[PDB]
Design a protein around this ligand. Sequence first.
Ligand SMILES: OC[C@H]1O[C@@H](O[C@H]2[C@H](O)[C@@H](O)[C@H](O)O[C@@H]2CO)[C@H](O)[C@@H](O)[C@H]1O
Ligand SMILES: OC[C@H]1O[C@@H](O[C@H]2[C@H](O)[C@@H](O)[C@H](O)O[C@@H]2CO)[C@H](O)[C@@H](O)[C@H]1O
Ligand SMILES: [Cl-]
Ligand SMILES: [Hg+2]
Ligand SMILES: [Hg+2]
Ligand SMILES: [Hg+2]
Ligand SMILES: [Hg+2]
Ligand SMILES: [Hg+2]
Ligand SMILES: [Hg+2]
Ligand SMILES: [Hg+2]
Ligand SMILES: [Hg+2]
Ligand SMILES: [Hg+2]
Lengths: 162, 163
Amino acid sequence: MQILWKKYVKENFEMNVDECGIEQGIPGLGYNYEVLKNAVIHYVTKGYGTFKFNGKVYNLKQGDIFILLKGMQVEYVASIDDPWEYYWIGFSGSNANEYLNRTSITNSCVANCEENSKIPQIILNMCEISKTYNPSRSDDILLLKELYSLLYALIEEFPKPF
Amino acid sequence: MQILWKKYVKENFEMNVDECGIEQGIPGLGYNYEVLKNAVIHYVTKGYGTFKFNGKVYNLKQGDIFILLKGMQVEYVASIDDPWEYYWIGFSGSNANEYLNRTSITNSCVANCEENSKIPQIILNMCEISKTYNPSRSDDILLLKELYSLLYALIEEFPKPFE
Ligand SMILES: OC[C@H]1O[C@@H](O[C@H]2[C@H](O)[C@@H](O)[C@H](O)O[C@@H]2CO)[C@H](O)[C@@H](O)[C@H]1O
Ligand SMILES: OC[C@H]1O[C@@H](O[C@H]2[C@H](O)[C@@H](O)[C@H](O)O[C@@H]2CO)[C@H](O)[C@@H](O)[C@H]1O
Ligand SMILES: [Cl-]
Ligand SMILES: [Hg+2]
Ligand SMILES: [Hg+2]
Ligand SMILES: [Hg+2]
Ligand SMILES: [Hg+2]
Ligand SMILES: [Hg+2]
Ligand SMILES: [Hg+2]
Ligand SMILES: [Hg+2]
Ligand SMILES: [Hg+2]
Ligand SMILES: [Hg+2]
């Protein structure tokens, strides 16, 4: 089960950080469900797993990304021999959804980032903020700044044609 | 008329970049008016000028910041001898105003940043983006990222005492 799962209030409608999490997968455990949340990006930090959507089964490993979007019927499962760990960021809002439409990643909902990608670092930085989250110290501003950085980095690394 | 004056559409209501500008003052000249815009932060990059608000007269120079807020009756004028250049960023939105009210400088509306302040660099970066603004290249995302960075840096350097 998950070592970290932070849920935030839905207070913003243009851009909102909904949740984040870290899960070390267990062999023989996966999830099979219709996505209820707006958008959830997963980054694979260790091991191996499968992501299945619309009859396509992807074998993913460290460096891979998969994104869940509202209404998708998905199945994602840790490998038996070497189960993955993933980090995730769930987010919503009218700006978020417009920016997701500017990246090719929402075509297949899977990507592989380069070893020098800013995407992993932003997700990890957002998770660190989540651990000691304090809006009185304006951690709410920092999280939203990082979410804008994350969506910019997805468009930069996985652009749609101009 | 100005080195830069980019005006943006009011498309966001929580956080919006309204405008960006760079102006080289003409000696002895400036502006005297009631502020109509939501919030406009100015950073003095060169020279000297005067900012007058609510019976106070500030003699500002490079490193100084002044902020214009809706309803303020202001006058700001370049010095006769060595007229200032300033950069500005106008912004609006419900969350923008909440964040601005976590700073100590919404009454005085004038500050001096430390020489290692992130504030000057963010404003400069926003002006550079504004010069070749292209939403097709997602410059709109970059400007909002920088506005969050700017409000975070203002709160870090000018924190309202929290209880
Ligand atoms: O949201 C990412 C998170 O999803 C969990 O699965 C949940 C999902 O969050 C929830 O909306 C739905 O009702 O039930 C699912 C459990 O079946 C995963 O457990 C977690 O690892 C992340 O992938
Ligand atoms: O907004 C900062 C910008 O203000 C200009 O002054 C304008 C102002 O923007 C406008 O709202 C008002 O109706 O007219 C003013 C001119 O009287 C300054 O010219 C410019 O240098 C910036 O300070
Ligand atoms: Cl100020
Ligand atoms: Hg897809
Ligand atoms: Hg990667
Ligand atoms: Hg987070
Ligand atoms: Hg995270
Ligand atoms: Hg997290
Ligand atoms: Hg700008
Ligand atoms: Hg003021
Ligand atoms: Hg300064
Ligand atoms: Hg600017």
